[PDB]
Every structure is written in structure tokens, then in C-alpha cells.
Symmetry: C3
Subunit: 333 residues, 3 copies
């Protein structure tokens, strides 16, 4: 059918780890879903030490926002590069088919905009990221990535084919940064992106991130910004890593149903302690909370988690179940 005859819906995106409102089960026929993103190059403090990088972002955040559509919707993205930016940007959707995921069609200089449309033919969670020719890993590792979820029109199903409905959804973007270091091991400082470039490339070539963070900074998903849930709630956590492998783990819980490589026509893996999301992939894990308290959600390379930053918290409210776990004899001499 002619695309002009389809309904259109405009979505306004929200900042991760939150996700724009949507329906799991498609309440309309196929639609054109309209999104707008504004590129912002900005300074960001990424750690407790106050290390500050020139970040490249979709819509002001690292990661970029989670977009949500249904299988066989059309995604129409208006991408704006304001004149206050210095660099050329584009966008590649792993969800899309052709033209380097859209990257060949979306090259915008500062002061320019473009509109891309693609059909979301495959259900799953997918990475999107910037990919300007000659400079891809630098943009991606400066924060310019996010994800898109293409739900099956009848929502998610378990390994047997019965409905799985989530009560809450969170989006964790994990970012590897590669801040250049001198012979002494201190982080170098740079006046312009072009003066940063070769040292950025050299730092990348070590394949050793200096920082690995959730939602753009060490401790971004802790304290007042901890994720929350209640006992008995079904939570979907979507987790992306555009460049580097990760292995999410909910300390004190499990992934009840996991799409480790994120594609919903496959049956989920059950009862996972830890699952591997390859670099360049988004995955999704569904868990029903059974106990209250603080949970840590970590990359289970524990060095990456507790020294380099890849750790956040859930604060869970509800009833303690002494059947599931109890202290029989509290620590004592």
C-alpha cells in the first residue's frame, strides 16, 4: 500500500534510562512513526575524578534515546545538526535494510538537516550509531549511539509461545570510552577535536577502555538515579553496546527470559545468571522481582564494573520472603 495512506504518529523521545510511552501489543495497523533528534556536541564529566571529554550525542544524552515501534511500521527520522556543532554526523540503523543502514543517506554538516524513512522489517532490539566515513569508531566511542526496539505486533512471547508482558522498561546503554594517556598514565587534554583525533585513534588501538559506564557516567544509575521496582513487577531491561562485548548480570536476581542477541523471532534463553551481548548488538532481559532491597546491575567482568564504571543499582520495595533466603545465624564470633 502507498505509504501516504498510512497513519502517522509523532513521538517525543525521553532521556535514558526511561523509554517513551508505547503499546506492547499494536493497537493500530502499520504506521509511519516520526522521530526527531538533535545532535549535540558537549563537554561531559564521566567519572568521580572529574575527567571531562568532548562527547558527541544524539539528543543531548549518552546513550541516545530508545525508539520503540512495531514490526512493519515505517520509521521516519528527522536528524538535525545545528550550526553550533563542528563535525559531520550521520546515522546507521542496524534495524534497517540498505545504504549502510541509512548512513550513506544521512550525512549532515553543521547547519543542515535530513529526513530518512525505513521499514522496520525485523522484530528485535537493534543498535543505531553515527558512522561518518573515515571516522566511525571515534564517533561511536564518543557516545554517539543508542538503540531501537521493534516489537512484534502481538508483543513478546515466551519459549513456548505464550504472552510475556512487562510492567516497566528501562534502557541501559553501556559506553566504552578511550581517553588518551601519556607515558605516566595521566589523561591528556585537547583544544579541538582535530588535535584530539590521532591520540584518540592511538588510545582506541590499545583496545583497553579507560572507562566503561552506564548512561554516560560512573554512578549515573545509582543513588537518586537508581532504577526502581516493586516485588512482583515484570521489568524489561534493554541493554546495548555499540562497540564492545558486555555481560550483564543482576546481582541477587536472574534473567528469567533473555534475548542475548536481542531478536524476538528466537525463543528466549531461560534462567540466565549472566548473558553475553556482543559489541554491535542490543539485547533484552525480562525479570520478575521476588525480593526487596538493593540490587546491583553490572557488567560481570567485575573489573569493568567496579573499577571502570559499569555498575548501576535497582532499589526494590516490597515484602522479604524468608522461604527464598534467610540468615539462619547472623555473622558472629
Amino acid at each position: 500500500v502507498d505509504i501516504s495512506t498510512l497513519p502517522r504518529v509523532k513521538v517525543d523521545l525521553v532521556k535514558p534510562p526511561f523509554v517513551h510511552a508505547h503499546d506492547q501489543v499494536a493497537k493500530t495497523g502499520p504506521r509511519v512513526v516520526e522521530f526527531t533528534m538533535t545532535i549535540e556536541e558537549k563537554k561531559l564529566v564521566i567519572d568521580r575524578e572529574g575527567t571531562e571529554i568532548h562527547a558527541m550525542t544524539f539528543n543531548g544524552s549518552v546513550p541516545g534515546p530508545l525508539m520503540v515501534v512495531h514490526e512493519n511500521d515505517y520509521v521516519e527520522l528527522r536528524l538535525i545538526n545545528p550550526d553550533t556543532n563542528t563535525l559531520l554526523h550521520n546515522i546507521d540503523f542496524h534495524a534497517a535494510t540498505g545504504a549502510l543502514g541509512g548512513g550513506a543517506l544521512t550525512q549532515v554538516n553543521p547547519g543542515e538537516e535530513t529526513t530518512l524513512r525505513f521499514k522496520a522489517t525485523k522484530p528485535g532490539v537493534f543498535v543505531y550509531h553515527c558512522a561518518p566515513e573515515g571516522m566511525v569508531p571515534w564517533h561511536v566511542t564518543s557516545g554517539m549511539n543508542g538503540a531501537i526496539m521493534v516489537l512484534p505486533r502481538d508483543g513478546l512471547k515466551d519459549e513456548k509461545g505464550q504472552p510475556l508482558t512487562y510492567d516497566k522498561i528501562y534502557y541501559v546503554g553501556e559506553q566504552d570510552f578511550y581517553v588518551p594517556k601519556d607515558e605516566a598514565g595521566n589523561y591528556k587534554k585537547y583544544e579541538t577535536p582535530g588535535e584530539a583525533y590521532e591520540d584518540a585513534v592511538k588510545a582506541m588501538r590499545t583496545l583497553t577502555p579507560t572507562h566503561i559506564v552506564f548512561n554516560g557516567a560512573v554512578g549515573a544509575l545509582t543513588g537518586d538515579h537508581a532504577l526502581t521496582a516493586a516485588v512482583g513487577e515484570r521489568v524489561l531491561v534493554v541493554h546495548s553496546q555499540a562497540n564492545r562485548d558486555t555481560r550483564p548480570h543482576l546481582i541477587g536476581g536472574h534473567g528469567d527470559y533473555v534475548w542475548a542477541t536481542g531478536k524476538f523471532r528466537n525463543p528466549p534463553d531461560l534462567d540466565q545468571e549472566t548473558w553475553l551481548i556482543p559489541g554491535g548488538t542490543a539485547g533484552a532481559a525480562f525479570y520478575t522481582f521476588r525480593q526487596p532491597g538493593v540490587y546491583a546491575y553490572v557488567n560481570h567482568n567485575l573489573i569493568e564494573a567496579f573499577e571502570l564504571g559499569a555498575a548501576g543499582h535497582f532499589k526494590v520495595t516490597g515484602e522479604w520472603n524468608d522461604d527464598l533466603m534467610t540468615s539462619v545465624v547472623k555473622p558472629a564470633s
Copy 2:
């Protein structure tokens, strides 16, 4: 039902790579299974060069012992930290639900003990490890980890749902160590754990292990300590890595049935040459031996295996099958 009305069984653990006696198919109803572990901080020689580290262990071994129970048993662990130790320890079971896997409830100073109980609600092999707040990766990477296997009550099944019975079981714990190095590349030496700590953290932050070993040392599963089997025997190998990805491979064999991420409600992967066990996970592979001789079981990053230590041997006895493999023309000029 009230837990006090359940049978109780005490298990005495054995040193890896061996596994305490158990039944694959549950011969009783749900039980409380009682385990005791004693923490021992000790010096360990980890390589042929005589490099010696201050190891932190459950029950005197790296890895800690494999515990085996059935789905919906209760695990009751008595954890003892004797006054001869210097550090605070606890335990996190990935098999358990709540309170950071038990870690929030099991903090023991030297001279103290504690008893934790949890219900083993999910069948699979699972990592356990020490996780004291502020210091997790150091304890884990100093050897303080093991695994627990929660068997389905009717034992293991193949991809079709028919019984798979193992004749022998072995437990391979793979340990990444990060021994601090100076500018020249020699291994530094330290008087106390507190004086070691920052250099330990710096060494960890390289993300480059200095040693990757099976059962606590280079060559621990070779020679007189080679694993053994006979042609026609069905062997289960449980393999854990608490911190870092590994990729087991049996040189000369296969994984006939593999749970790469270790969870028994999923059908096994068949005919694997090599399988990926993510950091923070335990996996299980079942193989029926068809040829005699020496087999090497390795992490198939071959640098990790043959230079850094992640290699052991099987010595297999029985009949050579010339149908499966033969030398047609022996090496000659």
C-alpha cells in the same frame, strides 16, 4: 511446607577437579543440604617460574569446591572465617534470589562465622564468589570463587527431552590473575594485602591477565593430575569463570551436548567444537569419548592456553578406532 519438617543431609566437599558424591536423579523429596566452608588466605605458587601470590580461598583450593543439589532443595551454608585470616569475606551465590546473592547477609570478619540458607529455585550450574563491598574484583581475582550445580529433579535431558546420564563429572575452574608488573615487566612483591591493594587495582585496570590457569596453577591438570576417562564413558565437565570470558575446547573431541551459559531448562547446543562461557557464568559440556590417548582441554584463545596457562590434559584408555581416524601414510621424506 515448614522447612524444619524437611530432611537434612550434610555434605563434605571435595577438592576440585573432583566432585562430591550425589545422585543425578533425585532419590529423595526436597531437602535442606548442609555445607560448611572454611576461608583460607594462603600463599600459592601459580606458575613454573615460582611466582607466588597471596591467594584468597574457599576451603583451601582455587577454585572453591563444586556444590551439588537439586532444584528446590534448600542450601544451607556455614561459612567460617578463622582468626588466622586478615580480611573480611562474604559469599554471593548466583543461584540464589535476594540480598546480593547472600553477600549482604554473610559478611564475616576474622574470628566470625555465619549460616545462610536459600532455596535453589532455578536448575543450572552457577558461579559463587566473594563480594565484599568496595573490594569485589580483588577478592574474586585472588581466587575466591567456585560453582554450584542445581540439577533438575529428573536429571539432565537432551534437546529432544530424553535422559542424559553422565558416568563421570569434573569441575574446571578457570582463574584470571593480575600480578602487578613494574616498568621493566617484572612481577612486584608486597608485604601486606593493604600495601598490595592499589597496585592490584592498577594491574586489574589493564584488563590483561598475567596468568590464566585451571585449578589454581599452570599445569595443575597435567601429568599425575591429568583427568582420566575410558573410551565409551560419558563425562560431564563443568567449567566456571567468575570474571572473564572463556572458550573451552577439547582438543581431539567435541562438546556433544553443551549448556554454554549453563542453565538446564534450555535445550543443549549439539556438536560444539568450542563454546563461549561469559565471565560471571558457569557452563556444562557432556562428551562421550570415542578414541584413546591424550587430549588437551584448553581455553581456545591459544595464547591464553599455551602461554598464560589455560590448558589441562585428559588421559583416555581404550581401543583405537581406525574407522574414525588413521594415518594412511606416516610422515616421511
Copy 3:
């Protein structure tokens, strides 16, 4: 049945990324399939800078050629080490059962040859590589690896069990090289392999490849050597990595059906954006092209791809489908 009563077929191998002619569906009963490979130690230029290594190859190429047989054929390999070589070589097939995959039976000094036969009992794609005792990772990381595909006798099937037929097949071997570097970071140069050895080992122990390439060199699968297809063609790409994990991704496409760990008795993963092939494994991905243009096929650690070399191109001819993707508003001020 006696092996001498089986038909014999001689195959002459072709240079990757191309694959010798074969039938997907077995047109004969079980056969002995005869292959010959000649070891060649040669100088190779591996990057745009003109960095030159002493490569060790099967049949003059990195990777070695893809061999193709059917389940329960016998593979008979004649391996020739000419007197112009300096080193001892052998071969280990992950497809074979016993004697370290053949490695214990195939040790050939320069001026010697050997013939090994094994039964291909398990369907899948499998790595083969050199594995001389005491020196395995050096040989493997100097290029001495390839793959073998053992097709099911009735060819490939989808997740439901219906036929999947490919129109073209390509073989991508991904090679991690570890060229030794001085304190300044320049690549060292060596007079003989024995003088190279310790520095090779030291470079390997960093676990940081200096180069990660497809088909033996940066840009080997670009330009005039780009892979090709037409819209609507079903392409199988076989991808191996003998030593190190990789995560293939077709920029602008997908893996419609993927065997990430390469073993055909398992159902394929559907609609993958990126898939993890563990070190020591071969995988296979099937894609039907739906759009024309240039596609990049990359390791989706984008540093590994765009800085260290792990990137090639597909040039695809055919009709552009504006339904699947279109530029609505071309980049403009």
C-alpha cells in the same frame, strides 16, 4: 563397510574467499574425499604501511582454503612440507575425532609428507590449524589456519526444518597478528624465525593484536576484490577465527539465518544484527540481499574493523527498493 570399497573424489582447492565446487545436497553415497595441501612459509605485506611478516600458510594463502564435504564422508589429506621451508608443521582438524584432531599423526619436517584420513562424523563448519607441540599459538597467529565445512547429507535447513539453499558461498578467515613493538611503539624486524620467537611470545602475551585482517591483509576484500552479489541472491558466508573472538556484522543487512557457533544440527538464530563467533570456532550466516549498493562486512568492534583492519565490502547490483528505505528530505541547510 570397508573404506576401500567407497568411491574416491579428488578436490582441487581454491583461494579464499572463493570455495571449491560442491553440491549442497549429497549426490552420491559416502565417499573418500581427497585433498592435497602444500605448506608455504612466505613474506606477506599485511597493511597499507607495508608492514611485512614471515607468514606460515596452508597452500600459499591466509586463511587456508575452505574444504567442503558431507556428513560421514572420509577426508583424506595429503600434507606436504617442501624442503624450502624451515619449520615443522602439522594439522589439527576440529571436525575430527582422536589424536589431537590429527595433530599427533601429521608432524612433517621440511622435505616430508604425510596422509591422514578421518571420518567427518558431525555436520558443521569447523576450524583447522597447525598445532606443533610447544609452539601452537605462534603458528596459528602467523596465519596457519582455515576451515572445513561438513554439510548435512540433505543440505541446510531452517529453524522449522525446511530447505535453505544458497546461491553463492564465501569464506572469510579473520586473522589476529601480533607484530612485536619496541618501547617507542614501532614494529620490530627479525632475521630468522628462531630470533623472532621470544619477542613473538612477548607480543602474543599482551593479548592485543596489532592487526586484525580478512583474507590476509588490510583491504584484501575491497575494491577490485570486493565480494559481489545481486539483489535477491542467497549468500552463505562462512567466517572463522582460530584464536580470538569476533563479531561479524553486514552493514546495511542482517544474518537471516545464523549458526554463530557453526553446527548444523542446531536450529539457526534468526534476524541477527551481529553474532559472536568464539575464538577457535567457525560460524555460518545466510542472508538474502534486498537492496543494491556497497555493504561493509566488519568485525563490530569498530576499532578492530576500521583501525586494525577487520573490514571488507560487498558490491551488490540490482533494483533500489524505496519501500524499504528512502531519503525523504536529502541533507540540506
